[PDB]
Ligand binder design. Sequence first.
Ligand SMILES: NC(=O)C1=CN([C@@H]2O[C@H](COP(=O)(O)OP(=O)(O)OC[C@H]3O[C@@H](n4cnc5c(N)ncnc54)[C@H](OP(=O)(O)O)[C@@H]3O)[C@@H](O)[C@H]2O)C=CC1
Ligand SMILES: NC(=O)C1=CN([C@@H]2O[C@H](COP(=O)(O)OP(=O)(O)OC[C@H]3O[C@@H](n4cnc5c(N)ncnc54)[C@H](O)[C@@H]3O)[C@@H](O)[C@H]2O)C=CC1
Ligand SMILES: NC(=O)C1=CN([C@@H]2O[C@H](COP(=O)(O)OP(=O)(O)OC[C@H]3O[C@@H](n4cnc5c(N)ncnc54)[C@H](O)[C@@H]3O)[C@@H](O)[C@H]2O)C=CC1
Lengths: 360, 362, 174
Amino acid sequence: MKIAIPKERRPGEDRVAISPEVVKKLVGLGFEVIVEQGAGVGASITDDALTAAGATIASTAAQALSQADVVWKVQRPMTAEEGTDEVALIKEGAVLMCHLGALTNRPVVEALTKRKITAYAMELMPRISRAQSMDILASQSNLAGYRAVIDGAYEFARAFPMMMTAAGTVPPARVLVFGVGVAGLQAIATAKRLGAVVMATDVRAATKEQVESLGGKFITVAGGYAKEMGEEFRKKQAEAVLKELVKTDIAITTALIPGKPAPVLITEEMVTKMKPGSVIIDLAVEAGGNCPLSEPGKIVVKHGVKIVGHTNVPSRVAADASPLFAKNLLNFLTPHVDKDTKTLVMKLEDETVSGTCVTR
Amino acid sequence: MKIAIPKERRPGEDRVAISPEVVKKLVGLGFEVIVEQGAGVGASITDDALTAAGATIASTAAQALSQADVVWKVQRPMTAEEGTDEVALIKEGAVLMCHLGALTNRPVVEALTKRKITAYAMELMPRISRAQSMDILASQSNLAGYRAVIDGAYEFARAFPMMMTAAGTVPPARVLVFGVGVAGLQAIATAKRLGAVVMATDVRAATKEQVESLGGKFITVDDEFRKKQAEAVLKELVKTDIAITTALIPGKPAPVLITEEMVTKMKPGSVIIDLAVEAGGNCPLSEPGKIVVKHGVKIVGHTNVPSRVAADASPLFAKNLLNFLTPHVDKDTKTLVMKLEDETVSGTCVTRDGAIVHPALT
Amino acid sequence: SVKAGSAEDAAFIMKNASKVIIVPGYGMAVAQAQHALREMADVLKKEGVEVSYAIHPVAGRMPGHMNVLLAEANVPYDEVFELEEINSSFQTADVAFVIGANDVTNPAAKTDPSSPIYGMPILDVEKAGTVLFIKRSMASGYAGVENELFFRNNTMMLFGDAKKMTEQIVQAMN
Ligand SMILES: NC(=O)C1=CN([C@@H]2O[C@H](COP(=O)(O)OP(=O)(O)OC[C@H]3O[C@@H](n4cnc5c(N)ncnc54)[C@H](OP(=O)(O)O)[C@@H]3O)[C@@H](O)[C@H]2O)C=CC1
Ligand SMILES: NC(=O)C1=CN([C@@H]2O[C@H](COP(=O)(O)OP(=O)(O)OC[C@H]3O[C@@H](n4cnc5c(N)ncnc54)[C@H](O)[C@@H]3O)[C@@H](O)[C@H]2O)C=CC1
Ligand SMILES: NC(=O)C1=CN([C@@H]2O[C@H](COP(=O)(O)OP(=O)(O)OC[C@H]3O[C@@H](n4cnc5c(N)ncnc54)[C@H](O)[C@@H]3O)[C@@H](O)[C@H]2O)C=CC1
């Protein structure tokens, strides 16, 4: 077989679906691994390090994809309308694997159907115990939870930890984490590392044990995700939190209802009650936002409060993000590779493949 | 007795020489505390909160300073020659207290002297043990050290701590600190706590113990020309991800500790934080106020790092002044009287009553 | 002149106490004795003894030195107090556990200008009933001046390394 991985020409994207470790493995399986001349300068992976593992270096995106039986990407390919017809570069008959963002981006899937490409959407992984290996949403959102705190620290004009000083005591920062999943838990862990006093809240009840284990305090207002509660709950979610939210210095917002847009936890009216120079990091900004003041791509200064809402947070940790994403891909691929008849035999029954597959 | 505190008109300066807590201590000492409107906005300190502590508010710097007997400021006042004559606003015969940078900047000293203003260079606070509560160099630089790590962590492409995911493990960031004074030593702590693997180096032999006390590792050889120890620095700097430079020999320019020939033998995606950028840089590729990139390695050289933590910096800066000031407020009579036998007053006092005093330049 | 004591001696003193307060300093950090120090404070908390940490603002070799290491060892902020709101509480405390500290306890700060420690605020450890120092030797502190508490008081010189002698104490307490 012959697998190919291109550079990401989507502006911002420094991530890649490859690493030198993953190149070794695919060769071991029986894949000629082709990569592009600089795919992963942002991920901080040199071409020669990929070649040491046993990968060819292509000149361009087209020469990489042209004879590619399998194609691994991070982002969905660009449609012709979007600028450059990347879907057309991929050989008709090839197997694509990336975060297609399928349910949103139907025009992309149309093109893949049009030229016989068997495309596999990684965001649509079933939430089953063994699938954590292959889940990109978790791997990337864990790194998004860490960096929430660093972006928070970067924008915050005070220091996080308590320091007893000759010139006096700087008090510890007060962090509040909204939503305690893969990202939310890391944010607690990371804020804790920097000496903050972390508190958190969630819809899910078993969360209280998770937060307390990291060393935070809990504030207490069906398949591995929060069911939407309604404004009955949203109203009760105001005043129970307000006590802490006022004196709170930094606010990470994680919450995501998988079907719907993101639930409004911090209103514009709540923002006003906080201290001046407080920071809010909105991670759900690309999906409506838990804070409706938050605008994608940019930091919104209003009410004496910074409101950060970067798009593509995992790319801001592109060098950690990328090898883990590549490992999610390999974990999905490995149980279907048939060496001895060195081919990719994607089982049509494995629940992994059922929820992943769309076109073929 | 009036004490005024203006807004810091210099560019890239969010700090202020006051806090509500210090206002209450000054009021208690028998002053009334005038402050220029919106002088603590940058430090997240509203004038509402200052008036709450018992402080008058002024409209302009003129209205603030015009009648003030004592004047607190963060960074040195500006002369006409620079653009805006802040020294002119200060009342004749008054007391000034700030970071003058007096020894480098003679014209600001002569300007204040022309106007009979008694100035105190807070950076010339003697290194005695009692004066550690008044040492502005320590308090600000400690925060600047903490910042380096946050700035390093921002520009860096991986996370600091090791993370064992279901989807595989990512190794921790490795950090190297050049210069283990107040700044770097807090950077070691801020790095180690974030989960990074931290190393450091220093000309002083007593440093190894300090570095080791935070869980850092001191670069030193196993076993002369000792300065083939740069091979040990090379050996680590090669696999270093973030390199925070601190070394800052005083008065003289910043000693070069990372040459370009070393920057090139270094991982692309690396970061260099140069806190010494304004003194010259310990890496001479570093440019004041901007993030240069060469040989793959980002070279960060922000000016006025303490102002990046302006909100924590400001109350500490103000307390340094208050700790220096409080001892000399008699108030059996409404008077500040500065004892000369006090060594803090000896060391910091540059000009007095229309004549220059300090033996550094007379 | 000098009194001395073993980890068995320090166990007899502190386990039979109502209130001890801990005074960390540069030696704790040097010896990285911070996880053992929480553990000794955990044993005393389980026994029913009152425990608090007294952080002199200038203890260690940097600001926030004792804080970061006590935080590494997962001491909660609740029990940590600064000099300015603690050293009245020493007289209502049976044992003053001083670990790696020497200059910050020296009462010559509030006595004579023949010392460079003069003028500086210091933790009033002498106010406690008995004062447990832990340093390796008779050697000076950062100042290069000797504490008068050494030749004084109910002061005990628990001579050795701070991690190991705190560890040996924890074993003696069970
Ligand atoms: N925090 C800061 O920002 C700075 C503080 N300082 C100075 O530091 C001093 C602070 O005092 P403090 O840190 O409390 O005490 P010391 O400064 O006296 O710390 C040194 C003491 O620790 C002991 N020690 C060294 N290693 C060990 C070990 N392995 N186990 C047990 N003890 C050990 C030494 O005794 P022995 O050799 O016998 O083991 C010595 O007496 C002040 O004088 C201050 O001026 C100065 C600059 C900055
Ligand atoms: N295959 C598997 O076994 C997987 C299981 N999981 C589990 O699912 C949980 C959450 O997963 P994530 O992907 O992080 O969830 P998510 O990304 O869909 O949402 C983030 C978190 O926000 C919370 N949340 C949503 N709406 C909220 C609201 N309105 N108010 C307060 N909190 C709200 C949820 O509880 C969720 O934990 C984790 O604890 C994890 O154990 C996660 C990934 C994979
Ligand atoms: N009032 C007081 O008692 C104070 C005491 N201090 C003490 O002084 C020490 C130094 O603090 P600062 O003056 O802020 O440091 P600094 O800003 O003068 O220099 C930083 C560090 O870089 C080192 N260095 C300088 N040039 C170098 C070179 N070419 N190569 C390698 N290393 C080089 C120095 O040894 C120093 O350790 C601290 O450890 C602290 O304990 C610091 C502030 C106040």
